[PDB]
Amino acid sequence: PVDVSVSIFINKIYGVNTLEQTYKVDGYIVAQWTGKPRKTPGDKPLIVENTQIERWINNGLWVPALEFINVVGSPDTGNKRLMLFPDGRVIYNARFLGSFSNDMDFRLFPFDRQQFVLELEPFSYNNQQLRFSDIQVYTENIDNEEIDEWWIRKASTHISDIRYDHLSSVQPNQNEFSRITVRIDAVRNPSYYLWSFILPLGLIIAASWSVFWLESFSERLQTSFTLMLTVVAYAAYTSNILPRLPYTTVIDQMIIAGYGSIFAAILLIIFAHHRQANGVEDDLLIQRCRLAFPLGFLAIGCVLVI
Amino acid sequence: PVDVSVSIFINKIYGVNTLEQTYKVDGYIVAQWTGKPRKTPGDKPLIVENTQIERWINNGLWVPALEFINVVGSPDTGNKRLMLFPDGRVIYNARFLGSFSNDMDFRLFPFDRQQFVLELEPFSYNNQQLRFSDIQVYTENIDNEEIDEWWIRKASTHISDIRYDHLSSVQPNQNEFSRITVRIDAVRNPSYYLWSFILPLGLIIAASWSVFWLESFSERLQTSFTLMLTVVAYAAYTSNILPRLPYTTVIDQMIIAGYGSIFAAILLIIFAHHRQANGVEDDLLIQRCRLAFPLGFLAIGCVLVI
Amino acid sequence: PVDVSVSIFINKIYGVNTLEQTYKVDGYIVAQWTGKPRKTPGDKPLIVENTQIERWINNGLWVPALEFINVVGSPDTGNKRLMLFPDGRVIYNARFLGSFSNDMDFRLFPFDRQQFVLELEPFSYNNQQLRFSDIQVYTENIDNEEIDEWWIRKASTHISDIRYDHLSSVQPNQNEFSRITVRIDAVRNPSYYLWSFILPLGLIIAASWSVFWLESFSERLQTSFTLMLTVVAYAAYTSNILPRLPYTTVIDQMIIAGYGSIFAAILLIIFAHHRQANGVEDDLLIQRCRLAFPLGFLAIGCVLVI
Amino acid sequence: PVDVSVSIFINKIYGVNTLEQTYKVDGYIVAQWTGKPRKTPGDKPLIVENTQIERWINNGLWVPALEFINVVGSPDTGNKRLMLFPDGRVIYNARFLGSFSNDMDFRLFPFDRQQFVLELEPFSYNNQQLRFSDIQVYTENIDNEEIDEWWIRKASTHISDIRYDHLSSVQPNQNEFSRITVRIDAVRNPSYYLWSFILPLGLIIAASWSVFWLESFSERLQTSFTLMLTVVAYAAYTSNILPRLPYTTVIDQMIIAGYGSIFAAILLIIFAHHRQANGVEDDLLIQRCRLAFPLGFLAIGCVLVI
Amino acid sequence: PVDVSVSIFINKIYGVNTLEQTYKVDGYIVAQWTGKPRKTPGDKPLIVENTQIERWINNGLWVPALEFINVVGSPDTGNKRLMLFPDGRVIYNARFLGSFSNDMDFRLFPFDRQQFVLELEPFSYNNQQLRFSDIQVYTENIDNEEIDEWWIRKASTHISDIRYDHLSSVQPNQNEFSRITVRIDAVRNPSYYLWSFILPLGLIIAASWSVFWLESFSERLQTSFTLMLTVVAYAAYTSNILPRLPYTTVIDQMIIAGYGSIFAAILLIIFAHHRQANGVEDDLLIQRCRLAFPLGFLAIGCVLVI
């Protein structure tokens, strides 16, 4: 059972694709294992670069294919490098850029709690064990977090053994491969969305209610039709700029709320008026519920967060 | 007639392209067949990885080219692997990611009933039979379906023989290739569209009718012009965010309905008024059809679903 | 002069790019010609697949490069295959996906009459004649045309000889290559555009005129400003969803019409009023031209289609 | 100093990228030079196609690398072809598709005067002279110009010598490479923009002024607020469909003009009214400047074109 | 310690991707170092072009892999070229196009101060020193800056030594690689954004205030609802055309300001009216604060720039 030591260097995690639950990772992979001692020119280790590596394979030099279990597509491999030591051991170092997959929940969108994952595992080797895994998130935590879209925490390794129940016609015990699993926790940067979506959406819902401080009945009603048109004009601006998803986010709900608030008002206003015993006996208290549901909406809103 | 045993491992079905009727599939293919026993170093099976396989072909080792009948483009092949057994048999294993085609009907868009298909078939072999086909949809049915865009059911195999009537100048019987056909049934997740499109669209159509609870004639009419402008502002928001298609979906019809409801009203309102024997004799009952077509629209709507 | 027999199998014609006059074609190409008889292992034809073909070339086996005259870019080649017969003849079969060009006129957009073309021609061979060309449009005419964007008719071949006047320093007669030209005629599916663009645009133009059935002068005018705003809100929805072009379509003109109809009304309304001999002597007949240009617009519209 | 004769065949110039000042060019390149006579099989010229050319290089056959100085990226090379003559001379022919750069000024957008350029130049050869350059714009001038976005004129060659002041540690005179420069002049097709942007934008500015033919003061003012909202609704439609740039076009200015015209009116209207010696003494002439700046706007507009 | 002399020729810096903090760079790289003198055919330097270089490597000729530390992906390499001198020294010249990364702050968007950076560094060599670095920004400073999106200043080099604390199991001192760092300072072109966003946004905020010069109370309020709808209609036009970011820009704030100004007015107007001791005693001074916050907004605005 060959012992391999992997070292992943994360350089940048970007381009999150909300719909496909994808994110790009740029970094380097380093694998080290020991082989039958070799005669290296001079004596100091031999450095084999790109094109050359493929040659050394054709001459027996074995090199284990380490797959990225959770990769969408196939990584963009940069510079490959083989460092051959005289005492046997071999060190493989290559830079990569790939798109990884993982279960991502964007229900609370504006305030996300996501976690980026890598999953290494020998493509075709039952007894080729992954010794120790080390990840260098040499990125800067409290650096300039208000410049980048996501804020992080700290790395997280975890080696394990995966058992497949439908392999080759093998029975003895060939069905356990060692898988390195890296995890990075990150939180989304609320800022932008608060000051450009939540806030103004609120001022719209607020000024929405000021339709009650209108005297006439026609004014009270005809104005909420211009108010309806405003929430639609907003849902457009919101949608054209927000990430498409299969489910509704928080913001998606604030928009529904704005739709109900205005439909509620429409009902009250066309109720207050025709709920009479004459013709214009608008219930002085209902027509003056200018403070009834404006705060009664912070009660329906503080129950959806409970 | 060589016997081949295929095994498809579906890992993720994503990126559905409504307009081109495309969808992406990530997984592995495993093909097994038996050949003339061989002398493998040691004795335990020989493992040939990437670069190497192409070499073994140049030395006679045959490997059937298995085409993906319904693939748009050419699959993104990851790690290839040849496992050569001493008793002959050969096992080919490779990871792939490709875009597949299939007839997709999106008439009832918000509520779709689609089915993802794969179609394997030897690219150039008449008598090379596909033995047994197995698919491991090791994805989780009732897991977190309210996180993913589509909900599934269960795999579905089916081997068969395809007959081409215009092949080489061959007559005997060379015109029957065996094709593996995999089918996966899936249903779209209505949620999002209901709570962010259907609902608010209804509140717009509802409050649309409240144009009748207006006293004056000018108010009753001039307001439906702001109401018209509202449905348009909605069709914009809807279109910019929904999947472009060559035909109309359900939502596309609700939008037409909102257009007709407002045009109907426009006709009634400019009828009730000028349908007099004086000048302002607005038919007290028609001007008060505030409950005539609001429910008479649930009759025109429940006949389109019949 | 080598005789070559081509057979094109169109599998799907999609992704029309209005602006670049591009369209994608997926299918297979089959070329057959006869060479100096060969000794094939066994005796039955020899099958050379992908990688291998490039090898047989290096050993003399000649294979003519057949260019796709009208291809934007370079086709996405799938599986290549050489079938070598003992009696000489060679059969080349490969699957392709490319983007083709052609002059496309989208003037009557909603109702297009386009034609998809392919153009094969030996890249570097003067006397290498293309024998017979056959195209298998094994797609289904009256199948589910109301599911696909385009409706077709039937294939259409045509071999010819092209003469270039500026080739190599050759004089004898080297300047005539044989070009296969395939043509497929198609018509666009009006549906969607009628029920989602033409119709509602008409209800807007119709209800546009009902600005005359208003009593006051201020109402008659101030209302047409909200009517103007409506046609603009529509041109936005239309444009964001329709295909960008360098010229105006039919729909683009109906939009101009709605702009003139409203500007015409603006003139009449601000004429009828101030065309007096007092101050409010609104020409009873002009102010009541509620049926003058509404049908007088079907006369200006039925002359643009003449 | 090797004499090379180049021949560029422009097939289609499309996809202009306003922001990056890019445009795509499809065509063929033909380079001819004479070498040490060779023994060609048979005697008639030898035809070397794709894969093969790379082989002949490995056997000494030299082939000058001709770079495309102004190419963004790297051309999409199609079919390559080497025609080797017995008398020495070699003819290189290959089809290409690349993205080229050039300084493009879109200040007068609707009416552009641009020029597409190509720039060939030996990548690594001081004394390898480019003999004669010929371009076949075998496209059709007055053909169907009202179908294509751009209208042309006629080709334009020009060979020259470029001097680099910072090359290798060479002094003698190695610093002059011959560069072929092709230029094609083209004009944009105004049509669409006039009938779908300029015209309707004018009818909006025109009907804008008719806010003066209103009696009351409140009507005269409150209506220009719906007029303001209209120009904005237009800038949206315009922007979403027009090409993003770093500077303002003509249309971009007409939109500013419409903004000023309405702000001007806002000032006059709120001046005429409060510029009294009572309360409602609206200067009969100013309130009746219904023809003052409507034509006084054709004076401010005919000075921006002077 | 091999001495290498690099020379970077920047040809064009374009395609800034605000969200990913990326920018494209086209140019050539030139690396020179001296090796063991060689016998070159003739005597004058040997020119090795593309395909060939890979060959000379297989025959020992070493070529250091120089990585682009801050590259997203992997550069698009054009023509490679090896110039081998008899006296040893080797000169590597290749054209590239890659996407580079760097921290970019777009807080003051309309007026940006950004800096484009390149970072070279030997991929696998501890003692391979980079001698002198030279960059030829042979672009034209005060040329046509009002045609390009960005304005520059002047190049800026800087060689240094980077120390990695987690390399191979090496202790002596193998952990210091030499890195070339190029920096180019650039400023964004405000123009467009001023005349198409800032200006018209101001005329909207300006004319926003003229809601005070309205007599009635209903007019003063109902008009600000059409004014609100106007700022939203603007945020839409702005957003669809501006670069998506995770934070708010200057323009994003002017939009918030217009939202507050109108919400402020809404409060005042619904205060002035109901802040009585009767019913319509609108505080003659407050209702006439037509000059209170219009200039009192230039005070809140000149404190956000302080």
Numbering used by the authors:
A (entry chain A), B (entry chain E), C (entry chain D), D (entry chain C), E (entry chain B): 11 to 316
Paper lines:
The proteins act as gated ion channels that are closed in their resting state and that open a selective ion conduction pore upon the binding of a ligand to a site located on an extracellular domain. ELIC is activated by a set of primary amines that include alkylamines, aminothiols, aminoalcohols, bromoamines, diamines, and the neurotransmitter GABA. ELIC is a cation selective channel that is essentially impermeable for anions.
In cation selective pLGICs, three layers of hydrophobic side-chains provide an overall apolar character to the extracellular half of the pore region while the following two layers of polar residues and a layer of negatively charged residues render the intracellular half hydrophilic. To investigate the role of this aromatic group for channel opening, we have mutated it to alanine and studied the mutant by X-ray crystallography and electrophysiology. The structure of the mutant F246A was determined at 3.3 Å resolution and shows a conformation that is, apart from the side chain truncation, virtually identical to WT. In electrophysiological recordings we found that the EC50 of cysteamine activation of F246A was shifted towards higher concentrations. This shift is due to a mutation of a residue located remote from the ligand binding site and thus likely reflects a decreased efficacy of the channel. Our results thus do not provide any evidence that the ring of phenylalanine residues, which is unique to ELIC, would stabilize the pore in an unusual non-conducting conformation. A previous hypothesis that the observed conformation would be induced by strong interactions of aromatic phenylalanine residues at the extracellular pore entry, however, could not be substantiated since the mutation to alanine did not change the overall structure and instead stabilized the closed state of the channel as indicated by a decrease in the potency of the agonist. While the bulky Phe246 and Leu239 at the extracellular half of the pore of ELIC would result in a smaller pore diameter, the constricting intracellular diameter, which might be the main determinant for the conductance, could be larger.
